[PDB]
């Protein structure tokens with residue numbers, strides 16, 4: 001609602017974490033933000049376009065990120081509108097995006113079953129929060145999740161061009177009805193969560209990596225399912241299949257998916273990937 005305003009001089013730019021057509025993302029030090037933390041690290045999203053439509057869309061977005069407050073939703077600290085670029089201040093997630101983290105902690109040390117379940121459960125938690133507010137993410141993927149201190153996994157949205165097919169759609173994460181009709185609901189977000197589970201248990205591999213964007217559309221629209229990852233116990237694959245029901249009305253709700261994952265996270269199945 002009422003967006004926090006950070007003074008430009010309170011932001012000290014330390015390095016560039018990445019960029020896009022939108023502008024740049026920086027690692028920065030931020031003064032007078034949190035109590036007892038005189039200086040703290042943050043990630044700063046800087047917008048290239050400073051036009052009236054760009055300023056209005058920014059305020060809309062900043063107000064929305066201000067409402068979204070949860071343990072597994074990336075923290076929004078405020079804005080800086082002291083000229084171009086317009087700056088959005090978020091918490092710094094030291095391990096970067098979940099996809100990169102998964103791959104870099106894959107068997108290619110490696111994350112064990114319990115760690116994978118914790119990751120999965122944390123993403124499910126953030127989604128229960130979003131589903132509660134009737135908020136549709138539309139782009140749930142491990143590349144839009146972030147990992148901070150203590151393997152704390154939170155959901156974000158960066159806005160990985162190989163993951164989208166031309167409007168640029170993340171088809172491999174999309175259920176049949178979103179590919180065909182461009183309709184995004186909590187039920188399609190559930191489908192995406194199931195693909196996010198597959199990604200977790202493949203250590204960030206691309207769903208349908210053997211196939212091209214146009215071949216993957218055929219797979220999904222013909223009801224062809226992603227195979228059970230070798231590191232995935234059958235109990236979790238059961239959860240993925242429930243997320244992938246062809247009919248949106250027949251997919252499990254995220255609250256249920258979370259409950260089953262939270263249960264598995266506390267008492268993990270005795271499963272060794274090496275045996276299958």
Ligand SMILES: CC(C)(O)COc1ccc(C(N)=O)c(O[C@H]2CCN(C(=O)Cc3ccc(OC(F)(F)F)cc3)C[C@H]2F)c1
Nearest residue numbers: 017018025043045073074090091092093096155156157158
């Ligand atoms: C990809 C790479 C180049 O390899 C690494 O780039 C990095 C590395 C690290 C960081 C970091 N934060 O430490 C980083 O920051 C960005 C991540 C994406 N952003 C959001 O997710 C904001 C947001 C959007 C929607 C939300 O609400 C929702 F979507 F959850 F509903 C909540 C938050 C903005 C910014 F935070 C980029």
Ligand SMILES: O=c1[nH]cnc2scc(-c3ccccc3)c12
Nearest residue numbers: 012013014015016017018026027
């Ligand atoms: O971020 C970078 N990447 C690769 N080389 C370099 S040299 C300097 C930077 C930098 C330093 C502070 C803010 C922003 C950028 C940098």
